[PDB]
Amino acid sequence: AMIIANADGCTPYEVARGVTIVRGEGAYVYDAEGRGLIDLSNSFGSVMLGHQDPVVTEAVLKTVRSGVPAAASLDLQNHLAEQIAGDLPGDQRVAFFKTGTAATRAAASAARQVTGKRLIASCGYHGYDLMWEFTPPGQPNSEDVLHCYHLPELIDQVLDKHAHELAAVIIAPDYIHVSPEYIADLFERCERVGVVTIADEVKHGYRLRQGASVTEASVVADMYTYAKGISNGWPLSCVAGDERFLKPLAEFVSTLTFEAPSFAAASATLDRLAELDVQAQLAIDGARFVSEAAKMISTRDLPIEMAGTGAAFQFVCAEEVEEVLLPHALAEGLILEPSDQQYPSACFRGEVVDDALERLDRALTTMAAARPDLVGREVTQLDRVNAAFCQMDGLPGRPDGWSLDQCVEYVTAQL
Ligand SMILES: Cc1ncc(COP(=O)(O)O)c(CN)c1O
Ligand SMILES: [Cl-]
Ligand SMILES: [Cl-]
Ligand SMILES: [Cl-]
């Protein structure tokens, strides 16, 4: 009777609200009529290996059938921490949580404890907690967090005004609409004035490479947060970082922080990502998908542009165009996430990619025939900016011809 209060919100599979998903296996989910759909949501990117991965499933099932209680499997817990710490440069300790929001709030709390300072600066989305609620540039939210929307000019403003008062800056990286060098510059500006940095890798950690995405962008951070990439859909997250920041998290423990099934899933997941060369293969397979998708769009003269590549790409279009693309893709058995990147898994390889392209080709054909008025429409700068803001929760640099004031006005109007 709408008794659940937080069902409406940022849940995946909104495009499929008119259908009923009952099964998942590999690259596919299946509806109640037995129809298979290629899944590019993958529980908002939490499923990096594929649904019902055989190795993850056997590890979980063995742990469930042992009945071993929480916090008794010390070797497994420490092994997982060693796996995570060993993929980061430096000497990290690891504190485990159950959601990405818990991990980012804990990292912020650790910075506050060490520095004795309160204010936090932020780029991107860090979770549902009120401390991560977006407010206009220069306006601290109810928990003393300032939002900079990935603009170096807005970072500079906060640093020029509060750098001596900042406990930390927390940046969720993204590379679809900006370069690795652009992201690195955001971190470096804060580093140069001595501000603690948190790389929020909840989305991209273990997706783009076997470790933190920022490492390949020539960035090091004081703490890193992970969740989606590490556990194939099981509820586990962490803060990994330098000892001086991880020591204040010693008592950040819940009754079920160490429930065994999720640790078994995560340790198996990290091993399988390495064994199957997942991120490097996705870079190849996703690049092929995005190139061929772009060609299909072009021959059909539809107002869509592909952005990104590999494991993180996006169908850039106006909202009213996306609202046609998504149902038409669903009708052809292809689940796309709206107003975001797509999230292919390790099973998005081989014949699955060709299957997805065939379904997209059919969807583009029906879309052009159902909505001939969209054929030949141009994609505008505003379309591109809107799509970036939806995807990365910030601006992809100051758009051409926009003043900083226009950027601030635009972001304010999105809230
Ligand atoms: C970049 C990033 N940071 C943190 C979070 C919050 O994590 P969670 O949804 O697991 O609470 C999310 C959403 N998963 C995210 O995309
Ligand atoms: Cl599959
Ligand atoms: Cl939690
Ligand atoms: Cl800029």
Automatic annotation (TrEMBL):
The UniProt GO MF terms for this protein read: pyridoxal phosphate binding; transaminase activity
Entry keywords, A to Z: Aminotransferase, Pyridoxal phosphate, Transferase
| Family matches, as Pfam families | Aminotran_3
Cofactor requirements of the protein: pyridoxal 5'-phosphate
Kindly indicate whether the keyword Translocase belongs to this entry: no
SUPFAM superfamilies referenced in this protein's UniProt entry, alphabetically: PLP-dependent transferases
The entry assigns this protein to a family as follows:
Belongs to the class-III pyridoxal-phosphate-dependent aminotransferase family.
Q: What is this protein called?
A: 6'-epimerase, C-6' aminotransferase
Q: Which gene encodes it?
A: gacE
